[PDB]
Structure formats: C-alpha cells, structure tokens
Symmetry: C3
Subunit: 293 residues, 3 copies
Amino acid sequence: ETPASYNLAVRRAAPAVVNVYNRGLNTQLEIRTLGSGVIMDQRGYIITNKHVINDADQIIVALQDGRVFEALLVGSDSLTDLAVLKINATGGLPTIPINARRVPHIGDVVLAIGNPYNLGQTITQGIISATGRIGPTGRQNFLQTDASINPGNSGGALVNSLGELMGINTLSFDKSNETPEGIGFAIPFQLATKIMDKLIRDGRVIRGYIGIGGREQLQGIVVNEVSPDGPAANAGIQVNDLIISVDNKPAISALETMAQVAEIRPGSVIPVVVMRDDKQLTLQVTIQEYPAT
Amino acid sequence: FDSTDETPASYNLAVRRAAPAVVNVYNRGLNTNSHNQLEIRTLGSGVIMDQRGYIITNKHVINDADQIIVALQDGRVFEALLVGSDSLTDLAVLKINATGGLPTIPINARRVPHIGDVVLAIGNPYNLGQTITQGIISATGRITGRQNFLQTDASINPGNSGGALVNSLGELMGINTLSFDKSNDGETPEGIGFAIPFQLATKIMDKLIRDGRVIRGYIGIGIVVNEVSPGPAANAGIQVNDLISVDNKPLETMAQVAEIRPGSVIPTLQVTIQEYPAT
Amino acid sequence: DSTDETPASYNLAVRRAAPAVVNVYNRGLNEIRTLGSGVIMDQRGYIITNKHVINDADQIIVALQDGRVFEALLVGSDSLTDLAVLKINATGGLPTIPINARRVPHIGDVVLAIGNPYNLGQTITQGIISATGRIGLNPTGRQNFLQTDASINPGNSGGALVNSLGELMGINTLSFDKSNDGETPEGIGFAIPFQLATKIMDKLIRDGRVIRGYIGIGGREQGIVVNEVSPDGPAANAGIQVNDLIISVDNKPAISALETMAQVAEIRPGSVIPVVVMRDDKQLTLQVTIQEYPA
C-alpha cells in the first residue's frame, strides 16, 4: 500500500531546478531580485526569466545538492521574458527531463518547482488550466496553471507527473476584480527550448521584422498598422490590404505567420501577396531585424 | 530513464467530456451612463444540461442583464433567453436556439459525491477563457440560508460562477457559485469555494423549464410553531403554540414541504398546501 | 456511460483520518476567544494541537465529528514548536489518527489537510508536500516544518495533515502571509511532522513540558563561532570564551549550526560531553555538563 505521490517527478526534475539570485552593489552586494532556473543540458546552460536577472551585477545560481556557481548571462529576450545563464561545472550536472514530442493537454497534473520567497525549493501541485494563453505581443503563448505560483517561482520549472518539463513559470495573475487564486502562467517548453537554442547560438534572439501590425472572400491576415520606414511601408504595403501569402507560405494565421517572419534571416527579400480593391498584389519586401526594446 | 513510453497523470478525460458543455456567459447591458454602448456588466459561466439548449448558470451572473450572450468553446455565440431563475438557490436557466446540436454536461444521477473526490472547476475566470482548476470536495451540505453546498478547494475565481464542477469521470458534481471572501484578520481565504450539488441543480432546472419559475410548497409556518402565516397555517386551525407528523413523515421538513404541489392537502389538523410567493 | 467507472478520490484517506480530527475551542470571559483543530493520537484521549491555539484558555472545549463534546485538560505546552497536548475522558472508544512510524514523508506526496477553517466545519483540502525541514517564516527555532500547498486557513491549526493512505504526516501549524510588493502568498503552509509531533507529545505526557539540553552559547557558521556565552551557563562554567571557533560536539562534528542545536537538545540535562574548539589555531577538548534549557 503506497500513498499517491508525485515524488517521482520531484526526484526527476527538482534537482535540475536551481535558485537564481540577482545581486547588486550599493554605495556592498545585496539581493535585489531572486527567482529560479532550470538546467536544460549538461553544458550548464540554464533557462530563466529575463526579469529575474535584469541589471544583475552578479548572478548566483544555487543548486539543491549544495553547489553554488556564478552564472554567466548568455543572453536574454525581453520579448518572451526569457534568459539563459551559463555555469562551468567540473562535476556532473542534473538536467531537466525534456520530451519534445510530448503535447501538454489541459487537465494534465503539473508540479511547479521554484524558490518562493527564498524559503528553498518548493514543490506545488496543480493541473494545466489552459493552453495557448496570451497575456498583447502574443509571443508568450502561456500555459495557464493552478499550481501555487509565487514570487520566486519565475524561471522555475513546471513539470508533469513524469517530471517532464512542460513550461517555465513566468507569471502569476495579479489583476483585481480581490486576489486571483490558482492562476499562473508558464512559457511552453517548446518555446523555452526554441529561445534557449537561439540565445546560446546568437547571444540573443534574432527575429525577422516586416514592420506590420495586423490581425487575422479570401483568407488572409489583415494589416492594421504599418511601421514607418518599415519593410512593409517601403515595399508599398498598406493597412487596409489583406495579406494572402508571406514568403511563399499561406497567411492562414496571424500568429503562425509572425513566427515564420521571426525565422527569416534579416536582409532577405521575400514575396508578400495582398488584396487591394479585390485585386491580388505581389509586393517584394526586405526583412529587417526586430527593433530593440 | 525514458518517459516517452510513460503516460502523465491527466484529468484531460474529464475535460474533453465536460468542458465542451461549459459555456461562457456574458451579462451585457447598454451603458445609459455613457452613450448606450454595450458593455459587459458581469461575466460568468454556464453549463449546457440538455440538447434542447437549456443552460444552467448563477442568477447573480445574469442579474440586471440587458442582454445575455452565451459563447461556446467551439466558437459559436448565442443570445440566450432567460428561461427562469431562483434567488434561493442562485440558479438560473438559459435557452439557446441552436439549429444544429450542442454539447451536454455528463450527468450521472446515481453518482454520489464523496468528500475527497477529485474535482475539476470549469469556468471563465477574469474572461481569460475556459479555465480548468483541480481540487477536491472539501465538504458536503455546507450551506446561512437553507442552501446545500459542495465545498471545494479547486481554485475558484470571478467568472467561474454558473460553471461546472466535475469529478475525474467528468460527471457533473456541482455548479460553482460562491467563494469564501470573509476575513478575520484581513487575510484572504484560500481554497474555499462552493458549488450547488447537481442533484439540486437538475431539480431546480427541470422546475424552471416547466413553470418558468420554481414553485415550491408553502405551509405558512420538539418543534413549536410560534406564528402562522395568514394562510395555509391559519387555516385548519393551527394554533400559535401548536405542537410531530407531516404527510405521514417524521431542515428535513422545509425541504420536503417545498416539493409539495400547491392544491394538495396534508393532515388532526388538515392543511392545504398552496404556492409560496417568492420574488 | 461513465456511470460504471470509478471517480478519482482521496475519500479513503478522509474516512480513516477525519473522525480522529477534532475541533478545539478556546474560551475566555470578559465565550469562544479562539478556535482551531486537534488530532487524537492515542486511545487514552491525548490530542495534539498548536500551543498558540489554546494559549490563555480558561477552558478548552473539544468537539468530535461523531458528535461527542469534552472539556480538555492541558497536559503541557511547548512554546518552541508551538505544540500542546490535551486530555479528555473517552467512553466507548475514540477515532484515532492513523500513524505509521515506518512511513517516511516524501516531497510530492499527496496530502489532505483536515481542519475547521473559519469554523465552517471539518474541511478537507488537497495538496502535496512542498518541502521538508523548512525553518518556517522565522529562521530561528529549527522548526523543521513540512511545507504544503494544500489550502491551509485559520482553523486548521493543530489539525491533521495526512497522505492519501490516511497516515498522519504532520500537524498543520502555520500559514505564510508575509507580504512584500503587496504579495499574497499562495499555497505555502507549514506542518509539524508526525514523528516529531509524536516525540513532543510523549515528552509532554511524561512531563508537563519538554526538556532539552542547553549549553549557554549563541554562534554562527568548518566550525561554529560563539558570539554570545550565557552567564553561569553550561559553557560559562566550562570557560568557553567569545570569538572562539567550535569544531565538534559530543563526538559529532559541528558542520551545520542547525543539525547541532538539535543534537544538544537531545542530550539529557546533566550528561557530560566533549566539545572541541579551535582557539588561537589550537585544538582544545573541553568538558561541559549539559543543563536544561531556561524555562
């Protein structure tokens, strides 16, 4: 007779969850912000929230086995509130279980591993409240969860009963009207990984940019705004016109497209077919790089 | 270790079963204060109980609603008609004229909710969209008032009202309605929500669909009856200090007599049960 | 048809443990001044509850789920761990909280919190074991609480925290409400483990209090310096000075200043133990007679 337990996922994933400390020196060293981190690979690279290590003079990463390192900011993305830290480990490193094929379903039991209020590594249990949750940028595409999330869980791991990483705890719903209960958000591992591999490889996230604002007869993304001196404006794209296709790919979803654009190497001239006056217009556009925050 | 072969503990089953039947209710009213623009006064949830399109929700979610918009997770949006409501149970039935069919909430009448039963709350907290939260049945028959509640620690928030509370199986257990807010030290209560038991919910719905309202028996009254309504009590000759048997039967009572059809007579004093005026 | 399937439930744990969890009412007159929860450990009628719950009680009324009500007598109160043992007269027997000494609490274990939140009645909130050995809200005290995200509210104090099997895991004691940034903590409660809980109970049943070894020293973290040396204390008579580093105590090295202050508490007052210290770069094995901790 064994008690129902998620200790398995705990022993599997908890080790790979670290305590990330941001400290600054003031007229000496003191912690200005603390959160959590998730060791993804053996190389020592760690994913965390950018808002955890912002303006960090020194980033201290504390593991559960006692070891304490000095993290190296590999890069950060304010667009997805993500950041990667590097740590040189001569000894073996615990990694987070990752299943790229795993599709998180609503209702899956999840565990939130982090360091709430610097009490130590806390494991809270909940489920996946929802998926594909945005919030305006729409880049975050959060997974909602009712697993107890608190200040110190940011950058922490959200794993299932198998210990497999599901997301990176980033947000707790704070909006009144009272105090929101059991509503937290996390970056899907699919996105967290995509950003990590890109931060390590480029020192930052490099995104294509058409300088267009639009929201999804023919089916296409409608343009609402056109960034001045932006690739769109330059090419001759207008707000009212409807984008049928982008770079030889159907503009079926405003969100799946913006992801396709972000993958275009800046400096690339791509076709963008639109619809003005019920007439198809093919406009060649030059991809810039996404403007700095 | 490889977990690809492994299967994660998931209540997705209950979700695919129940969720599609839980709808987003939008209490909308023209803003007379401004320029008569339609605005969402209140948003809660609803539960589609049968194929006919009868949806259960909280009365407090549709009060003072100039328009009641029901949105299904499948995208569809209907202008729900208020079939009826009940202040006492805070329940309300809506109706949607769907040409096609529609999802219904899994209901198991013979299912008895137990304290400890894993439950899932399905609603639209803060209009984020259909949110699922997990908890358990913390208690039963919680209630002051005469109401009977399933208590639950499943995280409940504004917008969950009228939403479905279900078990692992996805069977409707209760209708999320309330949330403990009262604070002794100014602190906010944690994991203390309340739901209308589905036995009570279905009962109130079927009545509302039939009578447009919930007509329940009225008597006008070691249990001593201090005073007597100028009605069914006053008749038959029931005294003020009058003192054991009702309808050949031994809170248990006022819920029993409430289910007595008006016009029916029950003894020896012989009183005729009528309709209890509510509003 | 789902009507033939089985609902996931922790009702099993509820039936085994719930009855044993009682409502503790603290009375004072200028009526109920305070209230909480209790757990019946033994058939004798001994109940465990938090000290704060029962403090300054002119009368302690206990109420069982089966209906019976008794006036409890306070066996003892331990300020340190915030525990209190109660006594009542039991006829026809009582429900007892299932305890498994062999069972070891595991982080991630599904735990039910049984208690009387806001006097709503016996409430069962579900969560897991977040962590073990936690200091609590305050670093001092070597609390060793079990952390749990199972909803814990006022009225669960002295209540039973149990696993899905129904085995007692800990006594719900504290909830985290500390606020910075305007934060409201969510799913962070603390409970005194059952093994610890059982241990304290006996020291209270055996004696109207808990006695722990004292050494008249206040230090910080290898070795452990000595910032303060209690006057006429065990170490005071031993000649232990200030600023001197400690290496080992009672044959047990002094790595952690927390695992050590727990060992010293175990040593029966009076016993004589060895204490090695590095002073001026020299090893000095001293002899100190342990005394009971100041009242």
